[PDB]
Amino acid sequence: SVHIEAKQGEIAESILLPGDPLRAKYIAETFLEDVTCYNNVRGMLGFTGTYKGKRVSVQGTGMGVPSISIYVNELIQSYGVKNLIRVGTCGAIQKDVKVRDVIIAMTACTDSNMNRLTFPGFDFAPAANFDLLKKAYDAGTEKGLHVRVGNVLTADVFYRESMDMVKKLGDYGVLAVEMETTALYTLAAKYGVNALSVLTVSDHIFSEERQTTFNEMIEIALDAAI
Amino acid sequence: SVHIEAKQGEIAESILLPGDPLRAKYIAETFLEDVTCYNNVRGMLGFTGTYKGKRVSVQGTGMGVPSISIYVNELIQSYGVKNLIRVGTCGAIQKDVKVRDVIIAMTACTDSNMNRLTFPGFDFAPAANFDLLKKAYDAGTEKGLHVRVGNVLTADVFYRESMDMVKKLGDYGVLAVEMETTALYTLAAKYGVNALSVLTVSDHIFSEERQTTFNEMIEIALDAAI
Amino acid sequence: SVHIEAKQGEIAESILLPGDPLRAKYIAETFLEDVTCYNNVRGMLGFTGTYKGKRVSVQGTGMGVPSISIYVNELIQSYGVKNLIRVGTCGAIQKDVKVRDVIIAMTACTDSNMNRLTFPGFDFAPAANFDLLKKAYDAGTEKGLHVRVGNVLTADVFYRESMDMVKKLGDYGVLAVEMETTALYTLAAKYGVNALSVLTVSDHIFSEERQTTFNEMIEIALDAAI
Amino acid sequence: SVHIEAKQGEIAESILLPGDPLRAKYIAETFLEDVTCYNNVRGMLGFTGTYKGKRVSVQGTGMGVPSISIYVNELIQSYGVKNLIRVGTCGAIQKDVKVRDVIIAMTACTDSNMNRLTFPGFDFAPAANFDLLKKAYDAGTEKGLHVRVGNVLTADVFYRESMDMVKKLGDYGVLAVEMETTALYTLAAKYGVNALSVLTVSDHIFSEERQTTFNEMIEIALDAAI
Amino acid sequence: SVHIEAKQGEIAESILLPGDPLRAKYIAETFLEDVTCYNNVRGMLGFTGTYKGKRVSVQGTGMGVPSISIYVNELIQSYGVKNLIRVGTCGAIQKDVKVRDVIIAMTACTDSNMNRLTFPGFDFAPAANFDLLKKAYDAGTEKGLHVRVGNVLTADVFYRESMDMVKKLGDYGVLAVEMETTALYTLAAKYGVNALSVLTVSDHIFSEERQTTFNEMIEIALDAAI
Amino acid sequence: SVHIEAKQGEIAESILLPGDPLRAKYIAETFLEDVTCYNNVRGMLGFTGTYKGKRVSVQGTGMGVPSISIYVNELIQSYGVKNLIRVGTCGAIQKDVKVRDVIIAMTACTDSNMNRLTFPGFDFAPAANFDLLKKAYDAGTEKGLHVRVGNVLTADVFYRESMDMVKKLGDYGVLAVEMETTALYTLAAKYGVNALSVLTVSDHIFSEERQTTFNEMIEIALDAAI
Numbered sequence A, B, C, D, E, F: 001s002v003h004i005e006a007k008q009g010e011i012a013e014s015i016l017l018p019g020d021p022l023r024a025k026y027i028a029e030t031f032l033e034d035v036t037c038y039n040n041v042r043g044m045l046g047f048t049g050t051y052k053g054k055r056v057s058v059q060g061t062g063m064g065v066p067s068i069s070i071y072v073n074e075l076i077q078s079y080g081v082k083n084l085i086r087v088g089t090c091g092a093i094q095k096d097v098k099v100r101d102v103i104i105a106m107t108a109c110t111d112s113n114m115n116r117l118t119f120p121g122f123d124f125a126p127a128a129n130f131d132l133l134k135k136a137y138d139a140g141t142e143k144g145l146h147v148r149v150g151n152v153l154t155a156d157v158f159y160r161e162s163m164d165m166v167k168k169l170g171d172y173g174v175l176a177v178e179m180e181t182t183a184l185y186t187l188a189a190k191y192g193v194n195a196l197s198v199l200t201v202s203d204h205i206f207s208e209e210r211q212t213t214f215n216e217m218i219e220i221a222l223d224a225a226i
C-alpha cells in the first residue's frame, strides 16, 4: 500500500498497534517467534510472527488521528486485517486513575473534526468491539492487573493552552488522554472489523519504569487477539 | 422536586426508567411487591416497591433528551438515586439486528446539541457504567436472550425528512434508534452515578407482541439493579 | 398514528397543545361540551369536544422539542389539523416580565440542534402565524390581561449549569424560557398550517395560584381557535 | 461618530433606514420639510426634517449586515435614536408573494455568523418591536396595501452558487430575501430600542415601476414613526 | 449589472476597489486622465480613465463582505475584470504596526460565515495572487514606504462587545482589522482572476492626515495594476 | 523534551522539517557536515550539522497536524528554534500543477479542528513568514525550478470517502494536499518565530523518481535557512 511495503499475505489478520514503531520492534522481539519485518517505509516498523501457534502482526501507527488513520485504512483495505488492538500509553485526567493502571477504552471523546465531517450535525460515539473488550477485560482480570473500562479523550493537541475542557471531561468520568482511539474505532466500524484500545497509564495530566506492567498488558492484548 | 412530588426517602437508590409512564405502572404491578405510587405530576407515574428483598423504584421519563434530562437531574440531585437503568424500546437500523433482540447500549451517538453546548469544540461520547453493563449482559446471557452490546443513536427527531445519515450510521455499526440514552449517560457521568440502557427492538426503521421478551428484559434490568 | 390511537376524523382541525396531559384533561372538563377522550397512549391524553358551537381538540405534548415534534407531526400529517395553539407555562428571564403575565411568542430562540440540521449554515427563526397572533392578542387585550408579545427561548435543558447565556438573551429582550415553541412553529411552517404559543409566566428564573389567569388564557386561545 | 459627521442633537429620535443613500435623499425631498443634510461621509447621506409636525431623520445604511450594523450602532449609541424603521426592497422566494407587496418582517433568518458569535450554541431569532409592527400593519391595511407579515431571510450573499437552501426556506414560509434585518433587529434589542423593517417586493428570486407603492410604503413607515 | 449601470466595455480589466465611493472619485480626479463616470447606482461611484497609457477603473465597494461581494461578482462575471486591487484602510491590532504603514494582505482571517457555507467542515484560507503581491511589494519597497506583508482580519462587526479574540489574533501575528479582503480573495480565486488588498493603517484598535501616504499607496496599487 | 532526547543547545536555531524521519537522515547524510544525531525517540530521527558554515538541524515530524504539532511545540518552547522550514511532499489537486513542481505555501486551508478550538467562531488563515517565503522563492527561481506560490490543503484524512470538497477547493485555486502546514504556520505565529513549507509534488489526486528535484528543493530550503 502507499505507506506499507508488505506483499499480500505478509500481514496477519490479527494485529497490535503501538504508536511507537520502536515498541513494535520490542513486542516482536520479546513475544513473537518466527519473526519477519515487513515494513520500514518512513521508519514505521511492522512485523509478523507467531504467538502460541497463531500468526500475529504488530505495526507502529505514529501519533494522532491522521497518522493512525493512514495505517488502519491500509491494513483493513489492502491487507484484509480483521482484529486490531491498539496497545498504547495515556495520561490520567482523574486522581482515581493511577499510573500503571490498564485502561480498556469502551469509547472515546475527541477534539478532532474527523467525525463531524463524516456525520454533519451529529456526535458520533466511536465504540469498541464488545467481544474483544470482554476478552481483554477477562484476561486482564485473570492476570491480576488493575483494569479500568471506560471513556478516554482522543486529542489532536498534546500541548493545549488551556486545560479547562480536559478537566471538565475528567469531571464527567473521562479517564485519560491519548491520541488515536477515535480513529481506530471509527474506521473499524466503517469496515465491519473488530477493534480495541488497551492503554497503560504513564503519568497524570495535572518505559522501563512501566515495563513489567507494559508486558503484562501486551500479553492480554495478544491473548484477546489469539 | 419541580416535576416529582415524592417526599424525601420515598424513591429507592436503584431505579428503572421506561419512557412510557404506563409501562412504569405495568412494571410495578407485574414485578414489585409492597408498592406505592410516589408521583403523578404531569401523569409521569413513579412507583417504589420491593423486588427480591430490595427496594427499587420505576419512573416514567417521557420521550426525548429534554424530558429524560429533567427527571434524571431531579432523581440524582434531589432524591439521591445511584443506579439508573433505562428500559426502553428502539428501532433497528441494520438487518442483522432483529425485532425482539435486547440491545445494551455501550455508548450513544446523537443529533442533540446538549453536549456540544457543554463541551464546545468536542465530541463527547456518553458511556455506560461498565459494571452495570456487565451484570446486565451476564444476566441476559444466562436468561437465554439475544443480547447485542453496541452503539445506538439518541435522536431528537423521530420523523426525519431524510434518512441518509441514519443509514450511514447503520453502516458504521450503530444498531438502533431511540430518544434518551445520551442524556442519561451524560448526566450519570456528570454526577458520578451509574447508568445503563437496556432496549427491546420493536421494529426496523427501513406491546403484547413483545411482552414475553419485554418481561424477560425487565427481569435482567431489575437483576442488574439488585 | 404511532403515538395517537384516534380514528380518522376524531381530532378537530383546531387544537390546543398543553405540555401536561393532565392540563388537557382539565381544559376538556372545564371548557368543552360533548367530550370524548381519543387517546391514552403513553398517558398522553387527548380530547375532542365542542366550544361555542365549534369542535375543538386538546392534546398533551410532553416536555421538550423532541416530544412535541412527535405529536405535532402526527396531528398535522395523519389527522389533518390546521390550527395549533400551544397553551403553556414559562419562566421569566427579565424583571419587567411578571408572574401571571401572558406571553404570546412572535418567534423563539433555541439551544436545540433541530433547525441547524435542517438548514446547515443558517439561523432559522421560527415564526408564529400572524393572523392567529393578532386574534389572540386582540382577545387578550379585550379580556383585560397583561399580554406581552415578543421573543422566548425554547430550551432543551431545564437545568443548566451556567445561566450566563440565558441572562444574555434576557438582555436582548428575550422574555421567558419554555421547551416547545421552536418545534411547533417550525413544523407548522413546514406543512403550511397555522401555529401560535400562548404562555403564562409561572415564575422567574433568577397551578391553583395561577388558575384564574390560566383559565382566562385558555379562553383567549380557544377564541383565537374558533 | 466614526461614520456620521452629525453634531449632537441633529439626528431625530425616529429614523428611516433605506439601504440606498439616494433613496434617503428621495425620501427627504419628497416627504419632509425644513430639511438639512447632516452627513455625507462615504456618500452615506443622512437628513433630518419635519413630517406632520414631528422631526424625523432618514439615513442610508448600505447593503449587508456589516454595513447596517455600523450605522445602527452609531445612531443608537452616539445619537440617542429610539425608533428605527428600515424601508427597503426584497426578492420574493415564494409564488404567493407578489411584486409590489409590502412585507413587514416579524423576524429574520440568516446565513450571517453575527449571532452565532454572540450566542455560541444558540439560534437567536431577531424579533421586531411588536408595537411598531402593529402600527405599521394597521397603517398599511388602512392605506389599502397588500401587506404580508412574516419571516424573511437576511442574506450575506446576494449571488449564491446554489439556491437549494433558499428554496427550502421558502417551503418553510420564509417570504423574501434581503440583506439587513437580522442586524437591525438584534442591535435594537441589545440596546432596548424599537425596530421594524418594511420592505417592498421588487422581484422574484426564481425604481419608477414601484414608485407609487414605494411612496405609499414610506408613508406607512413615517406614520409608524410619528 | 444589477448594481452597476455601465455598458459593456466601459470598465477596464484592471480595477482599484476603495471601500469609500468618495475615495474612488478622489483617485480618478487625482491620478487618472480621460475620465468618465460609469456608475452612480446607490451612489457607489465608479470611473474609468487612463494611467500611464493604460485604461484602469476605480469602483467603490461599500463596507463589509456582503457589499464588496456584490460588486466583485458583478465586475468579474458581467464586466470581465481580471485584476482587482482593494485600496483600503485598516486598524492595527499590534503595537509593532504603526499608523501610516502599508499592509499588503497575504491572506485574511474572518468571523464571516461566507466560506463555512461554501466549504462545510473546512477552514478556507483566502489567498492573494502572488504575482500581484510581489509587484506591489517591490513597488512599495522602491517608493520608500513602510510595507508589511502578512495576515489581516476581515471582520463583519466593526463594533464588537469583547475584543478578546481580536487581541488573541494579534498575538498570532494578525496585523490589522478591515472588512473586505476575505470576500475579494475568495471570489477572485473562484473565478480564476487576480486579487490583492493594499491597506493604509489609519489607527490602532487598542483622511488628510494620511493623504501623502495614501497617495503613495494608490500609486503602488496603480503600478501593480499597469 | 517529552519526545526529543536532545540536550540543551544541540538543536540549531534553523531547522528543516521533513515528515519522514528517513528523509531527515538522507538530508543530513547528503548535505550536512559535522553531523550528530540528537534524537531517536520513537524513531523520529533528528540531526544537527553544518551547511556552508552555519549550523542547521533536520527533524522528522511524522504525518498529520497532531504529530507535527508535538515536535514544533517542543522545538520552539524547549529548544529555542527560530526558523522552521517544512520540506515535504504533496498531491496535486489541479491539472495546471505538475509532478515535480515545487510549491511554496503562502497559507493553508484545513479540515482540522485545531484552529476552530483556539478561535471559536473564526476562520484562522495560517500564513507563512513573508521574508522566508521571498528568500525561498528567489532561490528557487535562480535555481531554475518550477516554483508555484499559493494555497494548499492541510488534510487530517489521507483517505477520504468523497473527494467533492477537495475538487471544489481545487476550483478555488488550492494547489495540492498535504498534512502539516496549518499546524506549523499557526504555532510559529503563536510563538513569534518564522515558518515556511516547501513541497515537491509527488502525484495527482485525480522517491528516486523525484530525487534530483527533491535535492534541488532541499537546497533552496537550506539556503532560505542560512
Ligand SMILES: O=c1[nH]cnc2c1ncn2[C@@H]1O[C@H](CO)[C@@H](O)[C@H]1O
Binding pocket: A019, A062, A063, A064, A088, A089, A090, A091, A092, A155, A158, A177, A178, A179, A180, A202, A205
Ligand atoms: O498525556 C498525554 N497526552 C496525550 N497523549 C498521550 C499522553 N500520554 C500518552 N499519550 C500517547 O502517547 C503519544 C503522545 O506522547 C500519543 O500516541 C498518545 O496516544
Ligand SMILES: O=c1[nH]cnc2c1ncn2[C@@H]1O[C@H](CO)[C@@H](O)[C@H]1O
Binding pocket: B019, B062, B063, B064, B088, B089, B090, B091, B092, B155, B158, B177, B178, B179, B180, B202, B205
Ligand atoms: O424507531 C424509533 N425511532 C425513535 N425512537 C424510538 C423508535 N422505536 C422506539 N423508540 C423509543 O420510543 C419512543 C418514541 O416512540 C422514544 O422514547 C424512543 O426511545
Ligand SMILES: O=c1[nH]cnc2c1ncn2[C@@H]1O[C@H](CO)[C@@H](O)[C@H]1O
Binding pocket: C019, C062, C063, C064, C088, C089, C090, C091, C092, C155, C158, C177, C178, C179, C180, C202, C205
Ligand atoms: O423556567 C422554566 N424553564 C423551562 N421550561 C419551563 C419553565 N417554566 C415553565 N416551563 C415549561 O414547563 C415545562 C418544564 O417544567 C416545559 O414544558 C416548559 O415549556
Ligand SMILES: O=c1[nH]cnc2c1ncn2[C@@H]1O[C@H](CO)[C@@H](O)[C@H]1O
Binding pocket: D019, D062, D063, D064, D088, D089, D090, D091, D092, D155, D158, D177, D178, D179, D180, D202, D205
Ligand atoms: O433578491 C434580493 N436578494 C438580496 N437582497 C435584495 C434582493 N432584492 C432586494 N434586496 C435588497 O437590496 C440590496 C441588494 O440589492 C440589499 O440591501 C437587500 O436588502
Ligand SMILES: O=c1[nH]cnc2c1ncn2[C@@H]1O[C@H](CO)[C@@H](O)[C@H]1O
Binding pocket: E019, E062, E063, E064, E088, E089, E090, E091, E092, E155, E158, E177, E178, E179, E180, E202, E205
Ligand atoms: O479599525 C477598523 N475596524 C474595522 N474596519 C476598519 C477599521 N479601520 C478601517 N477599516 C475599514 O474601513 C471601513 C470601516 O470603517 C471598512 O471598509 C474597513 O475595511
Ligand SMILES: O=c1[nH]cnc2c1ncn2[C@@H]1O[C@H](CO)[C@@H](O)[C@H]1O
Binding pocket: F019, F062, F063, F064, F088, F089, F090, F091, F092, F155, F158, F177, F178, F179, F180, F202, F205
Ligand atoms: O496526496 C496526498 N494526500 C495527503 N498527503 C500527502 C499527499 N501526498 C503527499 N502527502 C504528504 O505525505 C504524507 C502522507 O503520505 C503527509 O506527510 C503529507 O503531507
